[PDB]
């Protein structure tokens, strides 16, 4: 998954927008993994907390 | 570019002599968007700097040669 | 019209000069790195030699 | 940005690109059918429960 | 044209740095079969008839 | 001056003006036609007619007129 992230760059032209952030705040959200229901469940069992 | 003003926004209008009617040929001021990709880099901020000691010389161009001489007793 | 022209001139020229000095900084970094690699001997030789 | 090179024969010129982006247009449709009995008993007026 | 000059010296007598190939990223040249012909190396040499 | 044009896209491109912003670009030349707009009561053909305004023409139904001439 981390490699799938790294393949994408942040080389964007717009340079500045309001960002999405976690409930705990601070670190902005970096992107979206859109998946299926079963893959969702299996990823949540392979990755913890 | 097919049309002179495709990617540009239209902001102002220069009217000949006085601002009356639309008969005058007129001049249109067009704007574009510019982005700078640079990310700031400093040699003293790179981890690489620990390896070398840096001294600033005001007029190196004058310098023809430089040398260091070691004297080692055994 | 000329005010817009002036601010555009200063923006272009300032960007050009900033990129110039940045290019000189990156050139300094690259020159130091290549100076290191020029005098770095290979490990398979340097181990037993040192 | 660009790196300033010495051994390279002629110093590299600074670079600027013009990139023209196009906006796509997507149109969306749905269909709803409604009966004349509704469209009429609506224009009428109720008087009795 | 902006020109910049720098100088460097080695502080110690013996070597102070060392490089090593860590991980092979790719093989550039195919290890295949390709004989070099001599008829393009020496084109002027020839037999009798 | 370069603001007042967009609703939000100017806010999207960024405000810093050292990284991104909206500059000046070439002037463009336009010449737009001039048109003389026409009115009937303003032409001189109106000298012939006698122009009265009937709101709803429908009321005129028979559409016959009896000329009563005396000599």
Q: Can you read off the two tokens belonging to residue A11?
A: 């080389």
| CA E36 – CA A46 distance, rounded (Å) | 55
Residue showing tokens 């000189």: C24
| CA F7 – CA F13 distance, rounded (Å) | 12
**Nearest-5° angle of CA A16, CA D20, CA F11?**
25
Alpha helices in chain A (DSSP H): 2-6, 37-46
HSE-up of residue D49 (Cα within 13 Å, Cβ side): 0
Give the 3-state secondary structure of residue B73: coil
Phi, psi of B34, deg, nearest 5: -125, 135
Q: Is E13 on the interface with B (CB under 8 A)?
A: yes
| CA F43 – CA F53 distance, rounded (Å) | 18
Chains in contact with A, counting 3 or more C-beta pairs less than 8 Å apart as contact: B, F
Give the 3-state secondary structure of residue C43: helix
| CA A13 – CA A10 distance, rounded (Å) | 9
Compute CA F4 distance to the chain's CA centroid, rounded to the nearest angstrom: 26
Residues in chain D: 49
**Nearest-5° angle of CA D14, CA D18, CA D21?**
150
B71 and E15 Cβ atoms separated by less than 8 Å? no
Q: Can you read off the two tokens belonging to residue B72?
A: 């080692």
Best of D18, D21, D23 to mutate (most B CBs within 10 Å, chain B)? D18
Q: Do C1 and B34 touch (CB under 8 A)?
A: no
| CA A2 – CA F52 distance, rounded (Å) | 84
Q: How was this structure determined?
A: cryo-EM
Could you report how far apart the first and last alpha carbons of chain D are, in Å?
Answer: 79
Give the 3-state secondary structure of residue B57: coil
| B residues 19-58 lying closer than 8 A (beta carbon) to C | 27, 29, 34, 36, 38, 40-43, 46, 48, 51-52
């Amino acid at each position: 998954l981390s490699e799938m992230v790294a393949a994408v760059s942040g080389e964007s032209v717009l340079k500045g927008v309001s960002t999405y952030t976690t409930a705990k705040g601070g670190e902005p959200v970096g992107g979206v993994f859109i998946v299926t229901d079963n893959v969702l469940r299996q990823l949540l069992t392979f990755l913890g907390e | 570019r097919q049309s002179a003003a495709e990617g540009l926004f239209h902001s102002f209008d220069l009217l000949v002599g006085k601002d009356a009617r639309e008969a005058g040929i007129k001049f249109e001021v067009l704007l574009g968007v510019y982005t700078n990709a640079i990310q700031y880099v400093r040699f003293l901020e790179t981890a690489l700097a620990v390896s070398c000691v840096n001294t600033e010389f005001k007029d190196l161009s004058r310098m023809t040669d430089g040398k260091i001489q070691f004297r080692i007793s055994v | 019209v000329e005010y817009a022209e002036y601010v555009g001139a200063v923006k272009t020229v300032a960007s050009a000069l900033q990129f110039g000095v940045d290019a000189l900084e990156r050139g300094l970094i690259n020159t130091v790195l290549s100076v290191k690699l020029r005098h770095a001997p290979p490990m398979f030789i340097l181990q037993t030699l040192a | 940005p660009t790196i300033a090179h010495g051994d390279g024969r002629r110093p590299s010129k600074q670079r600027t690109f013009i990139v023209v982006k196009n906006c796509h247009k997507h149109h969306i449709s749905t269909e709803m059918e409604l009966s004349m009995l509704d469209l009429e008993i609506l224009h009428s007026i109720p008087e009795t429960p | 044209e902006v020109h910049h000059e720098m100088a460097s010296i080695d502080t110690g007598l013996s070597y102070s740095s060392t490089m090593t190939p860590a991980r092979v990223a790719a093989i550039t040249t195919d290890m295949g079969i390709h004989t070099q012909d001599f008829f393009s190396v020496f084109p002027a040499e020839a037999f009798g008839n």
